Amino acid sequence: FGRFTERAQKVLALAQEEALRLGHNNIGTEHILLGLVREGEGIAAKALQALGLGSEKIQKEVESLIGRGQEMSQTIHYTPRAKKVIELSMDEARKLGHSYVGTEHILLGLIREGEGVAARVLNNLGVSLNKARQQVLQLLGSNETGSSAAGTNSNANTPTLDSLARDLTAIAKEDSLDPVIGRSKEIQRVIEVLSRRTKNNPVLIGEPGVGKTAIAEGLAQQIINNEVPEILRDKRVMTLDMGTVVAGTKYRGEFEDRLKKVMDEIRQAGNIILFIDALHTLIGAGGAEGAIDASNILKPSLARGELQCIGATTLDEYRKYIEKDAALERRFQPIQVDQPSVDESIQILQGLRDRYEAHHRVSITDDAIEAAVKLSDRYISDRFLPDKAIDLIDEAGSKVRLRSFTTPPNLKELEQKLDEVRKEKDAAVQSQEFEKAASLRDTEQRLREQVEDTKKSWKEKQGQENSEVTVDDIAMVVSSWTAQTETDKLLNMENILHSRVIGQDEAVVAVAKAVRRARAGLKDPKRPIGSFIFLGPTGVGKTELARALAESIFGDEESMIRIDMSEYMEKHSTSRLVGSPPGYVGYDEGGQLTEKVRRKPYSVVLLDAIEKAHPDVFNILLQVLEDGRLTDSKGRTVDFRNTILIMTSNVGASELKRNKYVGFNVQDETQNHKDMKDKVMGELKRAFRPEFINRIDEIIVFHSLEKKHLTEIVSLMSDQLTKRLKEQDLSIELTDAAKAKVAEEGVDLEYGARPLRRAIQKHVEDRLSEELLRGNIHKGQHIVLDVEDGEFVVKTTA
Amino acid sequence: FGRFTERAQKVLALAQEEALRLGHNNIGTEHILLGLVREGEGIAAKALQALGLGSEKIQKEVESLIGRGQEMSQTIHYTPRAKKVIELSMDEARKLGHSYVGTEHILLGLIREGEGVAARVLNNLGVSLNKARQQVLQLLGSNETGSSAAGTNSNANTPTLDSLARDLTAIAKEDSLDPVIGRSKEIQRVIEVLSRRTKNNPVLIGEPGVGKTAIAEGLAQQIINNEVPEILRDKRVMTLDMGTVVAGTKYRGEFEDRLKKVMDEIRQAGNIILFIDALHTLIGAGGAEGAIDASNILKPSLARGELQCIGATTLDEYRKYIEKDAALERRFQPIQVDQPSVDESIQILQGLRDRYEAHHRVSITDDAIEAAVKLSDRYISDRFLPDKAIDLIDEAGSKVRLRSFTTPPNLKELEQKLDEVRKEKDAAVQSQEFEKAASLRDTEQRLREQVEDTKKSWKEKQGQENSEVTVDDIAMVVSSWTAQTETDKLLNMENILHSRVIGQDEAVVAVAKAVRRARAGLKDPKRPIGSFIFLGPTGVGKTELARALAESIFGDEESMIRIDMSEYMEKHSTSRLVGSPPGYVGYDEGGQLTEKVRRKPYSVVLLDAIEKAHPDVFNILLQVLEDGRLTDSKGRTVDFRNTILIMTSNVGASELKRNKYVGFNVQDETQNHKDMKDKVMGELKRAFRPEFINRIDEIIVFHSLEKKHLTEIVSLMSDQLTKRLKEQDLSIELTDAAKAKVAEEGVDLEYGARPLRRAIQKHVEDRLSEELLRGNIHKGQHIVLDVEDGEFVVKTTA
């Protein structure tokens, strides 16, 4: 373990002394035994001496098992028996508590390791081996700790405080506990619920979902010193926990009987505080289920303040307790409970980082935590504000030690060598090849040991590397799952967003900067990270930007919703049954929009075609854009904070399907640019409400494509082609010359961004494939699609 | 078995020695016994010798039984008894482990086979039969390997490992384990999630599915040597086995107690790795009911990092774990899981090739293996990417062994002869006919031995067949459920689609080549391997091609969906229906379309008439045409990846239908071909959208009711007549002359292939049946439908 006590380690080192002193190549088990008795006293040492085995008795036998010499101490490590004895003490101390191993455990371990040289020493000297293991044990007392013992107090406390349970106050008198976190005003407010008497029962309302029990340790501390009543001092805090009741009982009826007994013993009352987790479940009122009706005993108890108690209830549970009354509502009284906000997250991270330095890393870093947390709160966005965080910290809190030790020192080849040896050796010895095996053995185990020496030479790489949990590290994780390599995504957002967006330096930079503004807490987070309307036709860069955002902002693309407004416009699905029959605004709110975004909160919510949806739909969209929430689906709250709203329209489309011209002039092109960035955002206003648009940060125009943008759609569709065919069959590349010939056809004055899919289809997909059908190209070769003399020719370069 | 160890086989063979050495012309059981003891000191031999039965006692008895001395042996074979001793020992070696058979088992088997002469030999020589079986048994020698016995001891290690369960590392240190081929890239990403302790726990979320456990065996192996962190210092990996916990307890309370016990012993913490299979089920979160609520012990265990564990959860299950939190989520953490990609598939196949040698019908070929995978991957697809594969290997991996013994040179006839003999013989011995029976036995047993000789002359039919699995072999089998005879289907696709489909050679070749283009992986197959528009009037070639495509691509015709989009109505029936219109488009998206294509993943989806059949449908289909997917049915994704989308049309029909027949045109014909290949596809564009059409592979025109196309429609319908009556037993053939006379009546510029059914009905069905009524033809004679001189005539030729 290397986290043993002295005492163990000492009998063991005494073993080596006898190794050479008695002449043993390998420090035998006989020496570990000698080690115990030669340290004189120590529970092992003493133990052997109890049975009558002094150093005298032992050594006569020991020298009679291996005499002198062998003073060479040939590769002095232990004998394998003796090595087992060391392993044995570790477990012989685990079972007997001890994480740090002593003398005793080794003598106990010897007995265990009973065919060993030691073992035979004792069984030869007339002392039964088990008589020895006994002897160590009966001196391995292992007195109380984490508690104290010296007397007996109390009579009436006996029946009550016994039952049920740990007694939180007790565990907080002598620490065997941790703060852990709060919820500080809750503790004040608990004493608000506890310095009264009619409604003397605290009732914590909130998600549970923060580790309610952390708050509880709060009361303990504060009820003692010094905010507590004048004659309703001498308070005791007694915990009532379900787990103790159910175990070995296995019945609700019996559980009720035991609980009844507990309420009776609480007769030390008028000074007692009871902790009741999930108070509704016991009350039995509300919902189809009652989840037991403890209420018969529990309710009058709650009202009197004999069961002056702390109720841990939730959002719904409080309804289902106050509904009874007036002793579950002439007892109850609620208090507003906290759960971590963004800053709180950071603090939690640090607090339990440090204890996983048992796990030799984690340790570090403030900044790293900040990455886990800060990046998470707004983006990914896959759990809760601190929960998200810790995973990120920890992936990376491992990640680097793995890439560190990606081999031995690169001496991974060594193991490979040693294999080949063993084989040669083995097979050679099985045939013989006598001395032709000789050298093979020697080469084998020589090598083997060398390998192992250098396998811990990247323990130098441990002392070099093995704590990294840094900004970038964490940040890599935050992008990895879906504050450096997420904020490098943020800072370099424009670069990332352009690479899929079909030209449109205009579109990209507008979205990029707006998301980047929010994404480091500069714009507005109680709104989407960016609200936008993206106008244009199909295949212009709209969708492509939505995607590129999912990737950049959250780390991976899968955090992207994409909702058709056409399914529930109540103006294009009204009675056309698009999707399913549900009455359409009800379909969107009551189900689809709210459920989906509630599932993925990070989601780039892409609400397609808000162009001609019913004006009521826009009121909902406006609420998403402003509030960063919608409340629908019978009172569920759906998080649009961390969303990136991108609402598309194809009313810009007309203008955004003209290219960046190739029209009547070449000065029509530089008049198409300005035309697309102006005409679109006003066809937007004509298509739907300004009030809606008033909650939208920037109106992104996705300019139709003139190369620059043409040769970038051709290179997106053709690149989507060349990659989807590599998994099953051929390697395709289109030369730049061939991407050019398609882009000329992606021109139209009136269809500047749509025609491209078909023309990649015909000119790439169809073209390689009709060339496999001829036998010009094939599966599994590299297909360069080239221009021959102004006609495509599929060439091979494999 | 035919795979026995020496010791057995030798004692047995020594019987044959005594057979002739004493003359016993059938090698008796007495000789098997002699066989044991004359083989000296095998466990059988040795055994008898312990009880006192040396060779001396045995042969002395033996020679006093059958004894001397007709040194030959009758067909030198055994007694039936002695043959039984061999069969018995084999089983007496199965019992005692032993895959093969050893000496002991033969003596043990003798005792068992106790009416044998040996048994009586031993019971004559003063040693009880059971004293002999005793001795062999208690010298238990059998086949061995998987050594792990040499004596072991530990103290605390005892409580954990007892319960519950196998140790993955252990089975991989004696290597009774196998890799197994993963799912390799997953394992690195786990050790990041595992060398943690702030979120200590990996939790694998994904399809389970080819064996989740392959990833698990991964960890074990990497955690030993050496790329493993020092974060993960001195780790052991222990696997959860749910089955042992539930067994022998038969109660939830007891089950909980055992799990609790395990969590306690995990006190070896910070040095232990726990593998928890199906981790959600124990947490018991979500649903109407839980799933088992081990959670009380398990949740804090997960949080502490004592149960630093690897969770194997499923698609929904992770939701139901973060649903608890933040210790079932602040410990837990999800990871992206692998299920083998197409290349990985191939490798698996081969990996288990060598054990298919046990059935001897594959090993080999690679080329076939690839087929198993690839052909299946793209074309149905009713299993996962490697499962599909392996099944095909073995499918073919038997197929040829069946052709082996169905047709060798057919010494099946031999056996047939031998039959006739026995009968004759038997009945002859019974008739008497006695010496006339004599020779009949002799002819019988002669035959019997010959029979048996020529069936193992078809061990030459084994050395010929008994391991291959060839290209075609796999491919044909791939066609049987669902490279050669699936890629011959691909290469010869035009030929195959024409052989069932009409004179629309234009259409056939266009579709054939377009599917064959995609289906060989050189044209976009993310979306259907062919999207199409099929123009023509109904019954022309359109439907028929949809069928022929299924047949060619998948090897079965009945993998063809078929939806009419025009049937979806009530899509404007507001108050018109009554007061609400609940249904039809909602049925199509919400259930029918998505479920059906998801059911048969790849299948010719034949979307009938979308000329104006809800303009919204064309958009919905467009998403299929582009992506290969639709998302409907409340979040199901339907893969139309290598479906063949065929969207039908009969709006071009009018021109497609037009003539090419003589008797009335000689210049409209040569204006109907050229007219159809342009004009048809433009009546299409008004009936769809260009946006739709741009994501279509090709726009197919079925030049129809030509001269030519007719007599092929007539030959499909009339051939369906001649075939549909054979089940009810009538043989019909139409001569080409009679199919021609009907074909004249479906052509002009106007009509369709509609009147062809009616006229086939009249001239074949109705007429032949009225010809049974007139008595020229009957039921079950061959009916030739001929033309006499221009007047129809039904002739008979059977």
Coordinates of all heavy atoms in Angstrom, one line a residue, chain A residues 11-20 22-35 62 65-66 70 73 75-86 106 110 113 116-121:
Chain A
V11 N 8.9 -4.9 11.2 CA 9.1 -6.3 11.2 C 9.7 -6.8 9.9 O 10.5 -7.7 9.8 CB 7.9 -7.2 11.6 CG1 6.7 -6.4 12.1 CG2 7.5 -8.3 10.6
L12 N 9.2 -6.2 8.8 CA 9.6 -6.5 7.4 C 11.0 -6.2 7.2 O 11.8 -7.0 6.7 CB 8.7 -5.8 6.4 CG 7.2 -6.2 6.5 CD1 6.3 -5.4 5.5 CD2 7.0 -7.7 6.3
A13 N 11.5 -5.0 7.5 CA 12.9 -4.6 7.4 C 13.9 -5.5 8.2 O 15.0 -5.8 7.8 CB 13.1 -3.1 7.8
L14 N 13.4 -6.0 9.4 CA 14.0 -6.9 10.3 C 14.2 -8.2 9.6 O 15.1 -9.0 9.8 CB 13.4 -7.0 11.6 CG 13.5 -5.8 12.5 CD1 12.5 -5.8 13.7 CD2 14.9 -5.6 13.0
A15 N 13.2 -8.5 8.7 CA 13.3 -9.7 7.8 C 14.6 -9.6 6.9 O 15.4 -10.6 6.9 CB 12.1 -9.9 6.9
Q16 N 14.9 -8.5 6.2 CA 16.1 -8.3 5.4 C 17.3 -8.5 6.2 O 18.2 -9.1 5.8 CB 16.1 -7.0 4.7 CG 17.5 -6.6 4.0 CD 18.1 -7.7 3.1 OE1 17.4 -8.3 2.3 NE2 19.4 -8.1 3.4
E17 N 17.4 -7.8 7.4 CA 18.5 -8.1 8.3 C 18.8 -9.5 8.5 O 20.0 -9.9 8.4 CB 18.6 -7.2 9.6 CG 17.8 -7.5 10.8 CD 18.3 -8.6 11.7 OE1 19.4 -9.1 11.5 OE2 17.5 -9.0 12.6
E18 N 17.8 -10.3 8.8 CA 18.0 -11.8 8.9 C 18.3 -12.4 7.6 O 19.1 -13.3 7.6 CB 16.8 -12.4 9.6 CG 16.7 -12.0 11.1 CD 18.0 -12.5 11.8 OE1 18.3 -13.7 11.8 OE2 18.7 -11.6 12.3
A19 N 17.8 -11.9 6.5 CA 18.2 -12.4 5.2 C 19.7 -12.5 5.0 O 20.2 -13.6 4.8 CB 17.7 -11.6 4.0
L20 N 20.4 -11.4 5.3 CA 21.8 -11.5 5.0 C 22.5 -12.2 6.2 O 23.3 -13.1 6.0 CB 22.4 -10.1 4.8 CG 23.7 -10.2 3.9 CD1 23.9 -8.9 3.1 CD2 25.0 -10.4 4.8
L22 N 21.7 -14.5 8.1 CA 21.5 -15.9 8.2 C 21.8 -16.5 6.9 O 21.8 -17.7 6.7 CB 20.0 -16.3 8.5 CG 19.4 -15.8 9.8 CD1 18.0 -16.3 9.9 CD2 20.3 -16.1 11.0
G23 N 22.0 -15.6 5.9 CA 22.4 -16.0 4.6 C 21.2 -16.5 3.9 O 20.8 -17.6 4.0
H24 N 20.5 -15.6 3.1 CA 19.4 -15.9 2.3 C 19.4 -14.9 1.2 O 19.6 -13.7 1.5 CB 18.1 -15.7 3.0 CG 17.8 -16.5 4.2 ND1 16.7 -17.3 4.3 CD2 18.5 -16.7 5.3 CE1 16.7 -17.9 5.5 NE2 17.8 -17.6 6.2
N25 N 19.2 -15.5 0.0 CA 19.3 -14.8 -1.2 C 18.2 -13.8 -1.3 O 18.3 -12.7 -1.8 CB 19.3 -15.7 -2.4 CG 18.2 -16.8 -2.4 OD1 18.4 -17.8 -1.6 ND2 17.1 -16.7 -3.1
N26 N 17.0 -14.3 -0.9 CA 15.7 -13.7 -0.9 C 15.3 -13.8 0.5 O 15.7 -14.7 1.2 CB 14.7 -14.4 -1.8 CG 15.0 -14.1 -3.3 OD1 15.9 -13.3 -3.6 ND2 14.2 -14.7 -4.2
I27 N 14.7 -12.8 1.0 CA 14.5 -12.6 2.4 C 13.2 -13.4 2.6 O 12.1 -13.1 2.2 CB 14.0 -11.2 2.7 CG1 15.0 -10.2 2.1 CG2 13.8 -11.0 4.1 CD1 14.3 -8.8 1.8
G28 N 13.5 -14.6 3.3 CA 12.4 -15.6 3.5 C 11.5 -15.1 4.5 O 11.7 -14.1 5.2
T29 N 10.4 -15.9 4.6 CA 9.3 -15.7 5.6 C 9.8 -15.9 7.0 O 9.2 -15.3 7.9 CB 8.2 -16.7 5.3 OG1 8.0 -16.9 3.9 CG2 6.9 -16.1 5.8
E30 N 10.9 -16.7 7.2 CA 11.5 -17.1 8.4 C 12.1 -15.9 9.1 O 12.2 -15.8 10.3 CB 12.5 -18.2 8.4 CG 13.9 -17.9 7.6 CD 13.7 -17.6 6.2 OE1 13.3 -18.4 5.4 OE2 14.0 -16.4 5.9
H31 N 12.4 -14.9 8.3 CA 13.0 -13.7 8.7 C 11.9 -12.7 9.1 O 12.2 -11.9 10.0 CB 13.7 -13.0 7.6 CG 14.7 -13.8 7.0 ND1 15.1 -13.7 5.7 CD2 15.6 -14.6 7.6 CE1 16.1 -14.5 5.5 NE2 16.5 -15.0 6.6
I32 N 10.8 -12.7 8.4 CA 9.6 -11.8 8.8 C 9.2 -12.2 10.1 O 8.9 -11.3 11.0 CB 8.5 -11.9 7.7 CG1 9.0 -11.4 6.4 CG2 7.3 -11.1 8.3 CD1 7.9 -11.3 5.3
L33 N 9.2 -13.5 10.5 CA 8.8 -14.0 11.8 C 9.8 -13.6 12.8 O 9.4 -13.1 13.9 CB 8.8 -15.6 11.8 CG 8.5 -16.2 13.1 CD1 7.2 -15.8 13.8 CD2 8.5 -17.7 12.9
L34 N 11.1 -13.7 12.5 CA 12.2 -13.2 13.3 C 12.0 -11.7 13.6 O 12.3 -11.3 14.7 CB 13.6 -13.5 12.7 CG 14.1 -14.9 13.0 CD1 15.2 -15.2 12.0 CD2 14.5 -15.1 14.4
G35 N 11.6 -11.0 12.6 CA 11.4 -9.6 12.6 C 10.4 -9.2 13.7 O 10.6 -8.2 14.4
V62 N 14.8 -21.4 12.9 CA 15.0 -20.6 11.7 C 16.3 -21.0 11.0 O 16.3 -21.3 9.8 CB 14.9 -19.1 11.9 CG1 15.3 -18.5 10.6 CG2 13.5 -18.7 12.3
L65 N 16.3 -24.1 9.1 CA 15.5 -24.1 8.0 C 16.3 -23.5 6.8 O 16.3 -24.0 5.7 CB 14.1 -23.4 8.1 CG 13.1 -24.2 8.9 CD1 12.0 -23.4 9.6 CD2 12.5 -25.3 8.0
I66 N 17.1 -22.5 7.1 CA 18.1 -22.0 6.2 C 19.2 -21.4 7.1 O 19.0 -20.5 7.8 CB 17.6 -20.8 5.3 CG1 16.5 -21.3 4.3 CG2 18.9 -20.3 4.5 CD1 16.1 -20.3 3.2
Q70 N 24.7 -17.7 2.3 CA 23.9 -17.2 1.3 C 23.8 -15.8 1.7 O 22.9 -15.0 1.4 CB 22.5 -17.8 1.1 CG 22.3 -19.2 0.5 CD 20.8 -19.5 0.3 OE1 20.4 -19.7 -0.9 NE2 20.0 -19.5 1.3
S73 N 22.9 -12.5 -0.5 CA 21.6 -11.9 -0.5 C 21.3 -11.6 -2.0 O 21.0 -10.5 -2.3 CB 21.6 -10.7 0.4 OG 21.3 -11.1 1.7
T75 N 19.8 -10.9 -5.2 CA 18.6 -10.1 -5.6 C 17.7 -10.1 -4.4 O 16.5 -10.6 -4.6 CB 18.0 -10.5 -6.9 OG1 17.5 -11.9 -6.9 CG2 19.0 -10.4 -8.0
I76 N 18.1 -9.5 -3.3 CA 17.3 -9.5 -2.1 C 16.1 -8.6 -2.3 O 16.1 -7.4 -2.3 CB 17.9 -9.0 -0.8 CG1 19.1 -8.0 -1.1 CG2 18.3 -10.2 0.0 CD1 19.7 -7.3 0.1
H77 N 15.0 -9.4 -2.5 CA 13.7 -9.0 -2.5 C 13.2 -10.1 -1.7 O 14.0 -10.9 -1.2 CB 13.0 -9.0 -3.9 CG 13.5 -10.0 -4.9 ND1 13.4 -11.4 -4.7 CD2 14.0 -9.9 -6.1 CE1 13.9 -12.0 -5.8 NE2 14.3 -11.1 -6.7
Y78 N 11.9 -10.2 -1.4 CA 11.4 -11.2 -0.5 C 11.4 -12.5 -1.2 O 11.7 -12.6 -2.4 CB 10.1 -10.8 0.1 CG 10.3 -9.8 1.1 CD1 10.5 -8.4 0.7 CD2 10.6 -10.1 2.4 CE1 10.9 -7.5 1.6 CE2 10.9 -9.1 3.4 CZ 11.2 -7.8 2.9 OH 11.6 -6.9 3.9
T79 N 11.1 -13.6 -0.5 CA 10.7 -14.9 -1.1 C 9.2 -14.7 -1.5 O 8.6 -13.8 -0.9 CB 10.9 -16.0 -0.2 OG1 10.1 -15.8 1.1 CG2 12.4 -16.1 0.1
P80 N 8.6 -15.4 -2.4 CA 7.2 -15.1 -2.8 C 6.2 -15.3 -1.7 O 5.3 -14.5 -1.6 CB 6.9 -16.1 -4.0 CG 8.3 -16.2 -4.6 CD 9.3 -16.2 -3.4
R81 N 6.5 -16.3 -0.8 CA 5.8 -16.5 0.4 C 5.8 -15.3 1.3 O 4.8 -14.7 1.6 CB 6.3 -17.8 1.1 CG 7.7 -18.2 0.8 CD 8.2 -19.5 1.5 NE 7.3 -20.6 1.1 CZ 7.2 -21.8 1.8 NH1 8.2 -22.2 2.7 NH2 6.2 -22.6 1.5
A82 N 7.1 -14.8 1.6 CA 7.3 -13.6 2.4 C 6.7 -12.4 1.7 O 6.2 -11.5 2.5 CB 8.8 -13.4 2.6
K83 N 6.6 -12.2 0.4 CA 5.9 -11.1 -0.3 C 4.4 -11.2 -0.1 O 3.8 -10.1 0.0 CB 6.1 -11.2 -1.8 CG 7.5 -11.0 -2.4 CD 7.6 -11.0 -3.9 CE 9.0 -11.2 -4.5 NZ 9.5 -12.6 -4.3
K84 N 3.9 -12.4 0.0 CA 2.5 -12.7 0.3 C 2.2 -12.2 1.7 O 1.2 -11.5 1.9 CB 2.1 -14.1 0.1 CG 0.6 -14.4 0.2 CD -0.4 -13.4 -0.5 CE -0.1 -13.3 -2.0 NZ -1.0 -12.3 -2.6
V85 N 3.1 -12.5 2.7 CA 3.0 -12.0 4.1 C 2.8 -10.5 4.1 O 2.1 -10.0 5.0 CB 4.1 -12.5 5.0 CG1 4.0 -11.9 6.4 CG2 4.1 -14.0 5.0
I86 N 3.5 -9.7 3.3 CA 3.4 -8.3 3.2 C 2.0 -7.9 2.7 O 1.3 -7.1 3.4 CB 4.4 -7.7 2.3 CG1 5.9 -8.1 2.7 CG2 4.3 -6.1 2.4 CD1 7.0 -7.7 1.8
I106 N 1.1 -8.5 10.5 CA 2.0 -9.4 9.9 C 2.1 -10.7 10.5 O 2.2 -11.7 9.8 CB 3.4 -8.8 9.9 CG1 3.4 -7.5 9.0 CG2 4.5 -9.8 9.4 CD1 4.7 -6.7 9.0
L110 N 1.2 -14.1 8.8 CA 2.1 -15.2 8.8 C 1.3 -16.5 8.9 O 1.5 -17.4 8.1 CB 3.1 -15.3 9.9 CG 4.2 -14.3 9.9 CD1 5.2 -14.5 11.1 CD2 5.0 -14.4 8.6
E113 N -0.5 -17.3 5.9 CA 0.5 -17.7 4.9 C 1.2 -18.8 5.5 O 2.5 -18.8 5.7 CB 1.4 -16.5 4.6 CG 2.1 -16.5 3.2 CD 3.4 -17.4 3.3 OE1 4.3 -17.0 4.0 OE2 3.4 -18.4 2.6
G116 N 4.4 -21.1 4.6 CA 5.6 -20.3 4.6 C 6.7 -20.8 5.6 O 6.4 -21.7 6.5
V117 N 7.9 -20.2 5.5 CA 9.0 -20.7 6.3 C 8.8 -20.4 7.7 O 9.0 -21.2 8.6 CB 10.4 -20.2 5.9 CG1 11.4 -21.1 6.5 CG2 10.5 -20.1 4.3
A118 N 8.3 -19.2 8.0 CA 7.8 -18.6 9.3 C 6.9 -19.6 9.9 O 7.2 -20.2 10.9 CB 7.0 -17.4 9.1
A119 N 5.7 -19.9 9.2 CA 4.8 -20.8 9.6 C 5.3 -22.1 10.2 O 4.8 -22.6 11.2 CB 3.8 -21.1 8.5
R120 N 6.3 -22.7 9.5 CA 6.9 -23.9 9.8 C 7.8 -23.8 11.0 O 7.8 -24.7 11.9 CB 7.8 -24.6 8.7 CG 7.0 -25.0 7.5 CD 7.7 -26.0 6.6 NE 8.9 -25.3 6.1 CZ 9.1 -24.9 4.8 NH1 8.1 -25.2 3.8 NH2 10.2 -24.3 4.4
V121 N 8.5 -22.6 11.2 CA 9.2 -22.3 12.4 C 8.4 -22.4 13.6 O 8.9 -23.0 14.6 CB 9.8 -20.9 12.4 CG1 10.5 -20.5 13.7 CG2 10.8 -20.7 11.2

